[PDB]
Tab-separated table of C-alpha atoms in Angstrom:
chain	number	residue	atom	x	y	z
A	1	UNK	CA	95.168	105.830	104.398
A	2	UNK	CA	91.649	107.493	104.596
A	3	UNK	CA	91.612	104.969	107.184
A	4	UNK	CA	94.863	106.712	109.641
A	5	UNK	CA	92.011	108.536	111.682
A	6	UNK	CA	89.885	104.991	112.658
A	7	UNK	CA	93.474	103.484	113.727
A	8	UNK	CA	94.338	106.679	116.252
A	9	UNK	CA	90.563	106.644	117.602
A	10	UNK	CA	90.864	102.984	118.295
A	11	UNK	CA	94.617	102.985	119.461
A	12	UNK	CA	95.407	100.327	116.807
A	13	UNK	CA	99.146	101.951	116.651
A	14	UNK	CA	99.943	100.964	120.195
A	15	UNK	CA	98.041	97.992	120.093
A	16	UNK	CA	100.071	95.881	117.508
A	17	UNK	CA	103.490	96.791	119.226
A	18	UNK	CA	102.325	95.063	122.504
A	19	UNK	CA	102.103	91.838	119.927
A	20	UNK	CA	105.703	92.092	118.875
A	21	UNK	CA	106.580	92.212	122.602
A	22	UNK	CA	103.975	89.416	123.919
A	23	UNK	CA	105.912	87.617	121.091
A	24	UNK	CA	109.758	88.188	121.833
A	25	UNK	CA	108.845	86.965	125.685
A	26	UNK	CA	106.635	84.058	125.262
A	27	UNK	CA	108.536	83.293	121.267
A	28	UNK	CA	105.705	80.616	121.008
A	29	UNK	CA	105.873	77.139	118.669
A	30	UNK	CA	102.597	78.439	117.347
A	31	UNK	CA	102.295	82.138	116.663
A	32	UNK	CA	99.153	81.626	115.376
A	33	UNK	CA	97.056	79.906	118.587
A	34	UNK	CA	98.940	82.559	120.754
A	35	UNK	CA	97.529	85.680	118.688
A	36	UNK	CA	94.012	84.314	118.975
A	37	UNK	CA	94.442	83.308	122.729
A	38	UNK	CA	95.895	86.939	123.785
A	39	UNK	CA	93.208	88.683	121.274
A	40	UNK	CA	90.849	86.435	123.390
A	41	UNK	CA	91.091	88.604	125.945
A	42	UNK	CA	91.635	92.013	124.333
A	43	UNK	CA	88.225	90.988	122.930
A	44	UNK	CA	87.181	90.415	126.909
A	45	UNK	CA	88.195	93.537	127.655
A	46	UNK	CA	86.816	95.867	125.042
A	47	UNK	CA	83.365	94.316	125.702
A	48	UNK	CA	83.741	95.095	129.384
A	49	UNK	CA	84.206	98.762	128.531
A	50	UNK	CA	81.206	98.531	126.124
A	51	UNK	CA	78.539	96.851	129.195
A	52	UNK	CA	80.227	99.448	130.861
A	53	UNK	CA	79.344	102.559	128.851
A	54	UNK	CA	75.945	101.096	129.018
A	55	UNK	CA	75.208	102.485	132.337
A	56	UNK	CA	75.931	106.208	132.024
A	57	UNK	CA	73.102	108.235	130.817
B	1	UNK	CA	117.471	91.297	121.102
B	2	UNK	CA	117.018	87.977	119.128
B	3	UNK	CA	113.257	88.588	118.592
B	4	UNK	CA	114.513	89.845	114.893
B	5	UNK	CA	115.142	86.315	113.871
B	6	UNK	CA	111.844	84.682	115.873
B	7	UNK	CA	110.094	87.172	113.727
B	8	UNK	CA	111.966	86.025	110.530
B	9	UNK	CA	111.470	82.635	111.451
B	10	UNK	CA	107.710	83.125	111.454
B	11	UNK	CA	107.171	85.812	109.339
B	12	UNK	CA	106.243	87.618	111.628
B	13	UNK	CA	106.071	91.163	109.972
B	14	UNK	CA	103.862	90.116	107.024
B	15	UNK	CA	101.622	88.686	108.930
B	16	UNK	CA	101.025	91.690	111.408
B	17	UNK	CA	100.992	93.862	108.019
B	18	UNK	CA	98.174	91.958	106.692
B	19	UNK	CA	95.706	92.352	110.274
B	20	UNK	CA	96.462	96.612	110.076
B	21	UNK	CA	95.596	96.362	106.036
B	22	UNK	CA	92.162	93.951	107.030
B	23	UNK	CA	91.188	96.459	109.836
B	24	UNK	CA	91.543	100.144	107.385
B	25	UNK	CA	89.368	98.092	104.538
B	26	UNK	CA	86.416	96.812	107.221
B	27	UNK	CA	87.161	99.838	109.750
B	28	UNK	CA	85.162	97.471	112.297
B	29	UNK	CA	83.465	99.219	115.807
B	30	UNK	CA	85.022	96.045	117.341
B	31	UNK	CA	88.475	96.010	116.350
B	32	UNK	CA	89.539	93.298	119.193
B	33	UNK	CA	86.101	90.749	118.284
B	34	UNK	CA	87.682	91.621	114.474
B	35	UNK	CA	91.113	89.961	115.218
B	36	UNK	CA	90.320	87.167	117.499
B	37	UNK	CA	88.174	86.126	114.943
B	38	UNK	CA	90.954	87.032	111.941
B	39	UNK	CA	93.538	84.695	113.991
B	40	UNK	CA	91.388	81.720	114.847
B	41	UNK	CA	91.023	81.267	111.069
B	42	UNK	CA	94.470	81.308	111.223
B	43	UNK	CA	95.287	79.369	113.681
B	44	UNK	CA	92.921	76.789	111.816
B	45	UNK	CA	95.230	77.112	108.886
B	46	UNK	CA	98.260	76.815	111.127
B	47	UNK	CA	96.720	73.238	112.845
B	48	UNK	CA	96.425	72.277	108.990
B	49	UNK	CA	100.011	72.321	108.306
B	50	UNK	CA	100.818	70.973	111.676
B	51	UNK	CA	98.990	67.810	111.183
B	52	UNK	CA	99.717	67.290	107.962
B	53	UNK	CA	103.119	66.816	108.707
B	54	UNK	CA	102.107	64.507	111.663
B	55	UNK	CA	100.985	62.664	108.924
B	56	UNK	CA	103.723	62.511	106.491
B	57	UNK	CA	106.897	62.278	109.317
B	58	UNK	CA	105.953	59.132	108.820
């Protein structure tokens, strides 16, 4: 793990725990669609904070 | 707290083990782009098996 440090900078730890509970709630027939749809906008998100960055100077 | 067997059921644990393992080898700058893109290949896969047993139900 010469990798631990990327997964605290990018919250990574947290992030994969809010899976496991999107998961137990919803308990879809397709895991698999669900992860990709909710990543979706996780995705939507992090770009968002990216455009946004892009304006301070 | 029956989400123990829905993650048994679906292997749940293995596959989330695999995405953490994926991310420390590529260490992407877009970690969330990274996995929405990891699971639609795997939701691909998992439309595969679906219809294939569409298929041979009968």
């Amino acid at each position: 793990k010469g990798c631990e440090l990327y997964v605290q900078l990018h919250g990574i730890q947290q992030v994969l725990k809010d899976c496991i509970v999107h998961l137990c709630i919803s308990k879809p027939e397709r895991p698999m669609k669900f992860l990709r749809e909710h990543f979706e906008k996780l995705e939507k998100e992090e770009n968002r904070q990216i455009l946004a960055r892009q304006k301070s100077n």
